[PDB]
Amino acid sequence: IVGGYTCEENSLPYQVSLNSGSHFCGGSLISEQWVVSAAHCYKTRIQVRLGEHNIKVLEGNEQFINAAKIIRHPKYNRDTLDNDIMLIKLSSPAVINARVSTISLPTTPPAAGTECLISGWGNTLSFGADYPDELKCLDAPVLTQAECKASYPGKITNSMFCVGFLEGGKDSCQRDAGGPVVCNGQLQGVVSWGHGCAWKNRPGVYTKVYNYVDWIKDTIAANS
C-alpha cells in the first residue's frame, strides 16, 4: 500500500497473509475454514497466516494453517487476469477470536463514491521497494466504470473495477494482491493489478466479488 497508514494492530481480523517462505499475497477470511484471494496468487502449497500485524516478528496472536484445497476460478485467464479470484480451504478451521474473524459477502456491487478500506503488506513506494513490517491500510473510494476503462483502455473486463484516486499518490501495490477491499463491512473487492503503484490516472484494478457470490457459496457448500 502506497500513501496509506499503519492499521491498528488486529483491527482487520479477516486479513490474512499468504506465505511460502515469505509474504507474497493477501487474502480475506470469509468463513472459519475458507479464504478468498486472487487466482494469480496461486501456488501448489500455501500457508495461511492469520491474526498477523507485524509479519516479521511473532507477537502473540498468530495462527498458521496450511491450505488443504485451492480452487482457482474455472474461467481465470493468466494473461488478461479476467476472473482473478480464488478460494483456499484451510486444513483446519481457524479459531475465531477478537483477532481472527470473518468478513461478509456483498449483496450488491459497490456504487461509485462508496468509501472502502484496502489493506496489505505490499510495497509502500511508487518507485523502488519498501515492504513494511506492519499491516498498511488505505481509505479509498470506488471509481466509475468509465473512469476505470479510460485509465486502462481495452483491459477492463466485466470481472474488474477500479478503486482509488486519479490524482495519484494513494494506491495498492505489489504483494497486496489477493487482499481485501471492504466497503460498508462487506468484501467488495480482491486486489488484482495495476500499471505502477499510485501513478496519476492509473488506479488499482480489483475483482468484483459480487459477481462470484453464487460460485463462492456453491463451491464452499460442495466441498464441506
From 19-27, 50-58, 112-120, 187-195, span contacting Ca ion (CB under 5 A): 50-58
Instruction: State which of positions 52-71 bind Ca ion (CB under 5 A).
Output: 52, 54, 59
Smallest distance from Ca ion to CB 51, Å: 8
Smallest distance from Ca ion to CB 186, Å: 27
**Of 17 and 28, which CB lies nearer to Ca ion in the complex structure?**
17
**Of 57 and 68, which CB lies nearer to Ca ion in the complex structure?**
57
Smallest distance from Ca ion to CB 119, Å: 15
Which one-letter amino acid corresponds to residue 5? Answer: Y
**Of 56 and 75, which CB lies nearer to Ca ion in the complex structure?**
56
From 46-54, 95-103, 128-136, 147-155, span contacting Ca ion (CB under 5 A): 46-54
Distance in angstroms (rounded) separating the CA atoms of residues 166 and 172: 13
**Of 54 and 114, which CB lies nearer to Ca ion in the complex structure?**
54
Residue 102: CB atoms within 10 A of its CB come to: 17
Distance in angstroms (rounded) separating the CA atoms of residues 4 and 25: 18
Distance in angstroms (rounded) separating the CA atoms of residues 222 and 210: 19
Place of cell 487482499: 179
Smallest distance from Ca ion to CB 53, Å: 6
User: Buried (b) or exposed (e) across 52-88, using 16+ Cβ within 10 A?
Assistant: bbebeeeeebbbebebeebbbbeebeeeebbbbbbbb
Q: How big is the site for Ca ion, counted in residues (CB under 5 A)?
A: 3
**Of 175 and 202, which CB lies nearer to Ca ion in the complex structure?**
175
Which strands sit side by side in the sheet containing 204-208, from one edge to the other? 5-6, 136-141, 115-120, 180-183, 186-193, 204-208, 160-163
Smallest distance from Ca ion to CB 132, Å: 12
**Of 59 and 139, which CB lies nearer to Ca ion in the complex structure?**
59
Smallest distance from Ca ion to CB 90, Å: 18
Q: Using a CB cutoff of 8 Å and minimum separation of 24, what contacts does 21-24 make?
A: 23/49, 23/55, 23/121, 23/131, 23/175, 24/175
Which residues of the chain form contacts with Ca ion (CB under 5 A)? Answer: 52, 54, 59
